[PDB]
Design a protein around this motif. Structure first.
Motif, mmCIF file in Angstrom:
data_model
loop_
_atom_site.group_PDB
_atom_site.id
_atom_site.type_symbol
_atom_site.label_atom_id
_atom_site.label_comp_id
_atom_site.label_asym_id
_atom_site.label_seq_id
_atom_site.Cartn_x
_atom_site.Cartn_y
_atom_site.Cartn_z
ATOM 1 N N UNK A 19 3.042 9.539 -9.625
ATOM 2 C CA UNK A 19 2.445 9.664 -10.839
ATOM 3 C C UNK A 19 1.432 11.092 -10.815
ATOM 4 N N UNK A 20 0.580 11.361 -9.832
ATOM 5 C CA UNK A 20 -0.425 12.293 -9.735
ATOM 6 C C UNK A 20 0.321 13.587 -9.678
ATOM 7 N N UNK A 21 1.443 13.988 -9.052
ATOM 8 C CA UNK A 21 2.132 15.135 -9.076
ATOM 9 C C UNK A 21 2.627 15.382 -10.514
ATOM 10 N N UNK A 22 3.072 14.228 -11.316
ATOM 11 C CA UNK A 22 3.779 14.431 -12.440
ATOM 12 C C UNK A 22 2.525 14.869 -13.421
ATOM 13 N N UNK A 23 1.470 13.943 -13.420
ATOM 14 C CA UNK A 23 0.310 14.499 -14.241
ATOM 15 C C UNK A 23 -0.149 15.612 -14.162
ATOM 16 N N UNK A 24 -0.361 16.297 -12.735
ATOM 17 C CA UNK A 24 -1.188 17.304 -12.364
ATOM 18 C C UNK A 24 -0.117 18.390 -13.005
ATOM 19 N N UNK B 59 0.866 -1.025 -0.076
ATOM 20 C CA UNK B 59 -0.155 0.090 0.071
ATOM 21 C C UNK B 59 0.620 1.383 -0.043
ATOM 22 N N UNK B 60 1.946 1.261 0.836
ATOM 23 C CA UNK B 60 2.871 2.308 0.845
ATOM 24 C C UNK B 60 3.468 2.909 -0.528
ATOM 25 N N UNK B 61 4.009 1.651 -1.030
ATOM 26 C CA UNK B 61 4.774 1.756 -2.156
ATOM 27 C C UNK B 61 3.773 2.239 -3.627
ATOM 28 N N UNK B 62 2.476 1.858 -3.149
ATOM 29 C CA UNK B 62 1.473 2.075 -4.290
ATOM 30 C C UNK B 62 1.115 3.671 -4.143
ATOM 31 N N UNK B 63 0.732 3.956 -2.782
ATOM 32 C CA UNK B 63 0.698 5.298 -2.264
ATOM 33 C C UNK B 63 1.903 6.109 -3.121
ATOM 34 N N UNK B 64 2.872 5.863 -2.956
ATOM 35 C CA UNK B 64 4.030 6.649 -3.320
ATOM 36 C C UNK B 64 4.191 6.716 -4.747
#
Lengths: 48, 48
Positions: free
Chosen positions: A30-35, A20-25
Motif C-alpha cells: 500500500x505504501x509503494x502504491x500510494x507513494x 506481522x510479515x503479512x501486515x508488513x507486506x
C-alpha cells in the motif's frame, strides 16, 4: 496439555510473526502504491 | 490473533488521535503567532 499449550503459544508467536510479515507486506505494497500515485500526481501538478 | 491485530491498530489510531489533538493546538498557536506577521506585511506593503 499445558506443555502442549506452551508449544501452541510458541506456534501462536510464529503465527503472530507471520501476521506481522503479512501486515508488513500489505503495508509496503500500500505504501509503494500510494507513494507512486502521490509522486505521479505531484509530477502531473508540477507539469500543469 | 484478530484481537491482537485490532489492539495494535487501535493503539496506532489512539497515537494518531493524540498527535491530531496536539498538532491542532500547535497549528492554532502557529496561526495566532502568524497573523501579526501578515498584519506587518500588509502595513509594510501599504507604506511601500
Amino acid at each position: 496439555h499445558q506443555l502442549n499449550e506452551i508449544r501452541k503459544k510458541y506456534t501462536m508467536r510464529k503465527s503472530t510473526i507471520e501476521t506481522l510479515r503479512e501486515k508488513l507486506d500489505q503495508l509496503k505494497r500500500e505504501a509503494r502504491k500510494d507513494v507512486s500515485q502521490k509522486i505521479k500526481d505531484i509530477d502531473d501538478q508540477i507539469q500543469q | 490473533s484478530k484481537i491482537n491485530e485490532r489492539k495494535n491498530q487501535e493503539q496506532a489510531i489512539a497515537s494518531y488521535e493524540a498527535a491530531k489533538e496536539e498538532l491542532g493546538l500547535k497549528i492554532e498557536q502557529i496561526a495566532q503567532e502568524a497573523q501579526p506577521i501578515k498584519e506587518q506585511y500588509d502595513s509594510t506593503k501599504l507604506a511601500l
